Amino acid sequence: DVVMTQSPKTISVTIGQPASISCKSSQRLLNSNGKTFLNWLLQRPGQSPKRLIYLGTKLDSGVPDRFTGSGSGTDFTLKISRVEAEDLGVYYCWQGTHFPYTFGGGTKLEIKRADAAPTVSIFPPSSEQLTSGGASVVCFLNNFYPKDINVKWKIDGSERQNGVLNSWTDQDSKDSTYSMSSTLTLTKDEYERHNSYTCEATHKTSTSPIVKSFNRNEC
Amino acid sequence: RVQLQQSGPGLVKPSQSLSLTCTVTGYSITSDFAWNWIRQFPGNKLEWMGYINYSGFTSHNPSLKSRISITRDTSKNQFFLQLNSVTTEDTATYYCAGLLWYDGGAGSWGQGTLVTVSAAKTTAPSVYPLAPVCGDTTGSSVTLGCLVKGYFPEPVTLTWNSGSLSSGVHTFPAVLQSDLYTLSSSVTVTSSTWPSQSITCNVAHPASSTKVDKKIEPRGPT
């Protein structure tokens, strides 16, 4: 089968600057009628892939003309003249010349922006959950940049490692930031046994963690 | 313009079959296009499964070795996917996609439907309000949230104030543990607006036909 190799794996670009990404196929994609069935697609976060380029070099229907496809034979390039935040996502190439049809492994475009510290919020378990037997403590670390971040949980001042599940958003095109949620789940009986709960976020924007805490049974 | 939409059961037992429908509107399925099925696995991995074209001719990936059938019903302007002998490796987001036969142009994909291959039982979520602690309400903005816990399979939908609150929202990918998922969402508003303007998280779990509309009440007197 034809192997479609994209490089780079990831690219981080400032709004207004150009971007260029490569797709190389293991076999030539020209056909017997002079057509090259090479498409480029973009997949934005939480969306389906959408058309960009087809026939190797042609703008697909409705696509902004900031996108250009070039190349021939086995080596293809997608260029974005000036990147906008809504261009972030994963770019794929696809070939339709050789059965079975195959896709590149994707190149993820990240928007580079100024560092931002996270906005940290901690939430006690709800009264409803506490009637259940379980207890979840939730901490949101929102709208930060760059994406790498660390969260540490403490119960009465001591660090707690098990029962922690984290989830990260994709980059947001509205402000080019990332967000993260961390949930500490305990039994209700263990939660009701201890007093103070603390979420600590460590990010490159500051040498000192952002700490948010509460006491059980205080508003 | 042409619009595509996948439908079909979101949870399939191992060794049974997935059966999906693609409804095409805005274009006749007997003209011009190849009607494709494509699926997506974790890791940006896309796999072309096959097509049926405008004349009814089909093609499918040898990777699917005899397990796949692609068919159509021209009276309903629909085409279909059946994939048999499924295993957990067939868990994926399934897409239908039309491309023009002549040049591969005009690619139009449905929204995608998740199919989970699992023996685990369908379970409705509990939806818990995340009300801010008192000490974090005295700023100019305030963050509230909702925790959707203990459901199976994916997906759920979550909106705030029936969708009329869409700015300042973060809805996080679900996390799976012991065959149940948990998902959270935060919303941030100008603090002086709350609690005068109420905030409700609306959760739907189609697989269990369950909806919850949870109003966030402040901690403290209500």
Curated annotation (Swiss-Prot), chain B:
Instruction: Please list the GO biological process terms of this entry.
Output: antibody-dependent cellular cytotoxicity; antigen processing and presentation; complement activation, classical pathway; early endosome to late endosome transport; endosome to lysosome transport; humoral immune response mediated by circulating immunoglobulin; immunoglobulin mediated immune response; phagocytosis, engulfment
Location comes to: Cell membrane
Disulphide bonds in the chain: C146-C201
Q: Where is the Ig-like domain?
A: 125-217
Reading the lineage from the top rank, the first entry is Eukaryota
Single GO cellular component term:
plasma membrane
Q: Which UniProt keywords apply?
A: Cell membrane, Disulfide bond, Glycoprotein, Immunoglobulin domain, Membrane, Repeat, Transmembrane, Transmembrane helix
Q: Does the keyword Transmembrane helix apply?
A: yes
UniProt-recorded Gene Ontology molecular function terms: antigen binding
Per the annotation, which location comes first and is thus the protein's main one? membrane
Q: This protein is called what? A: Immunoglobulin heavy constant gamma 2A
Species, as recorded: Mus musculus
Q: Which gene encodes it?
A: Ighg2a
Covered residues, full protein: 1 to 102 of 398
